[PDB]
């Protein structure tokens, strides 16, 4: 059953551009173990093929057999329901709160980065830090699979690699691409790095960069930086 993901091209019109939703789906497809390919689209220079396939012009989109699917969340839910055991792993998180943890972070960063008002900068860095902190608390809070197993020096502190346990789940495919943007953009434009003291977050990002499903599907740092150049440069 043929599977082809269409994604937003970057600045040369060929390579992967900045698009967390595109990366999210590329991640799900990789984690499913399914045979798929990926076509980048220069949206300013669309092939007649892509034009016929997806008249609405939405990106990303998925061709599955003969059927075109748009809307990233809906595609994700479709992939989860159509690619099941025993042939493909379920990737849905077991704990519903894994799906909501960290979700307000991208919006705090969006306000932070778009801001050009100096008296509001310190408020906005704080809103972003507090959001990251709440994700940190999630990542260090033991989940039901870890019930009552510990180490005297680290009691009540989760050792798990990712949001919902030790395997990547749909919840990570959603958050990780957004959190990667946050990291790259804020370093480049705002002298900002996630504090060391957020150890859950740092371990998470570290175990994520160790995984080729995340790392190989990231657009280059340049591509993300260029995407944000106009909105980010505004703060004097």
UniProtKB/Swiss-Prot annotation:
GO terms for biological process: chloride transport; platelet aggregation; positive regulation of osteoblast differentiation; regulation of mitochondrial membrane potential; signal transduction. The modification N6-acetyllysine is found at residues 8, 114, 126. The modification Phosphotyrosine is found at residue 228. One of its GO terms (cellular component) is vesicle. Coiled coil: none annotated. GO terms for molecular function: cadherin binding; chloride channel activity; oxidoreductase activity. It catalyses: L-dehydroascorbate + 2 glutathione = glutathione disulfide + L-ascorbate; chloride(in) = chloride(out); iodide(out) = iodide(in); thiocyanate(in) = thiocyanate(out). The active G-site contains a monothiol Cys-X-X-Ser motif which mediates glutathione-dependent redox catalysis. The protein seems to have very low affinity for glutathione, even though glutathione binding was observed in protein crystals. Belongs to the chloride channel CLIC family. This is Chloride intracellular channel protein 1. It comes from Homo sapiens. The lineage of its organism: Eukaryota, Metazoa, Chordata, Craniata, Vertebrata.
